[PDB]
Design an enzyme around this catalytic site. Structure first.
Site, PDB file in Angstrom:
ATOM      1  N   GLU A   1      39.547 -22.140 -21.168  1.00  0.00           N
ATOM      2  CA  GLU A   1      38.657 -21.743 -22.007  1.00  0.00           C
ATOM      3  C   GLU A   1      37.700 -20.544 -21.511  1.00  0.00           C
ATOM      4  O   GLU A   1      36.994 -19.692 -22.003  1.00  0.00           O
ATOM      5  CB  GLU A   1      37.365 -23.104 -22.301  1.00  0.00           C
ATOM      6  N   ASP A  30      35.527 -17.295 -31.148  1.00  0.00           N
ATOM      7  CA  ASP A  30      36.750 -17.908 -30.465  1.00  0.00           C
ATOM      8  C   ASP A  30      38.102 -17.336 -31.275  1.00  0.00           C
ATOM      9  O   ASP A  30      38.074 -16.662 -31.844  1.00  0.00           O
ATOM     10  CB  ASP A  30      36.352 -19.507 -30.590  1.00  0.00           C
ATOM     11  N   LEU A  66      31.628 -24.679 -29.065  1.00  0.00           N
ATOM     12  CA  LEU A  66      31.605 -24.258 -30.443  1.00  0.00           C
ATOM     13  C   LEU A  66      30.153 -24.480 -30.982  1.00  0.00           C
ATOM     14  O   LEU A  66      29.585 -25.341 -30.713  1.00  0.00           O
ATOM     15  CB  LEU A  66      32.471 -25.000 -31.578  1.00  0.00           C
ATOM     16  N   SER A  80      53.588 -38.388 -31.510  1.00  0.00           N
ATOM     17  CA  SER A  80      53.494 -37.773 -30.166  1.00  0.00           C
ATOM     18  C   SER A  80      52.866 -38.935 -29.413  1.00  0.00           C
ATOM     19  O   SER A  80      52.947 -39.135 -28.138  1.00  0.00           O
ATOM     20  CB  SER A  80      52.665 -36.410 -29.951  1.00  0.00           C
ATOM     21  N   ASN A  90      57.919 -33.070 -29.349  1.00  0.00           N
ATOM     22  CA  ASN A  90      57.161 -33.115 -30.591  1.00  0.00           C
ATOM     23  C   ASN A  90      55.936 -32.462 -30.583  1.00  0.00           C
ATOM     24  O   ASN A  90      55.418 -32.043 -31.735  1.00  0.00           O
ATOM     25  CB  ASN A  90      56.712 -35.020 -30.749  1.00  0.00           C
TER      26      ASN A  90
END
EC number: 3.2.1.17
Length: 164
Positions: free
Chosen positions: A11, A20, A32, A117, A132
């Site tokens: 990040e 972002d 966020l 998954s 996947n």
């Protein structure tokens, strides 16, 4: 390496409101603020979050505090989630970090959506699961970060980050 160092690599750290990869208003270590288009809505959320008038800027300490909260909430979220908890409990310590990283990026709901998954990881079919996971908007949109996480699930080591 630990979850914190891992997410810090993925990040980055920004002390000024920024947009972002999705164009949303963010601050610090991937925190966020709002999906709203208003920079003003962003600044308000920011102030609400820090408990002071920040005028769009925060210190490193503030960023870290937010980061601690966010990691904590990601873990607690996985633990409360009926779809996620069993997977997390089945995993080794490194792979646990790869799941926390997805949750931090995309939220509980988003990850809980990767049904197939999730099943493969639970069954410990590393290779099948890596395949996947890559068939997702997530991988197409942030391929370098998705690759690192996926490698982490595939190998169960920190190789993808030892680089970085």
């Amino acid at each position: 390496m630990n979850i914190f160092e891992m997410l810090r690599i993925d990040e980055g750290l920004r002390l000024k409101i920024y947009k972002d990869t999705e164009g949303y208003y963010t601050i610090g270590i991937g925190h966020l603020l709002t999906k709203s288009p208003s920079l003003n809505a962003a600044k308000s959320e920011l102030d609400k979050a820090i408990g002071r008038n920040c005028n769009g800027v925060i210190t490193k300490d503030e960023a870290e505090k937010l980061f601690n909260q966010d990691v904590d909430a990601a873990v607690r979220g996985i633990l409360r989630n009926a779809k996620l908890k069993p997977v997390y409990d089945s995993l080794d310590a490194v792979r646990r970090c790869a799941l926390i990283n997805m949750v931090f990026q995309m939220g509980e709901t988003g990850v809980a959506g990767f049904t197939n998954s999730l099943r493969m990881l639970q069954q410990k079919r590393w290779d099948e699961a890596a395949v996947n996971l890559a068939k997702s908007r997530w991988y197409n949109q942030t391929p370098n970060r998705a690759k690192r996480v996926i490698t982490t699930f595939e190998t169960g080591t920190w190789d993808a980050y030892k680089n970085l």
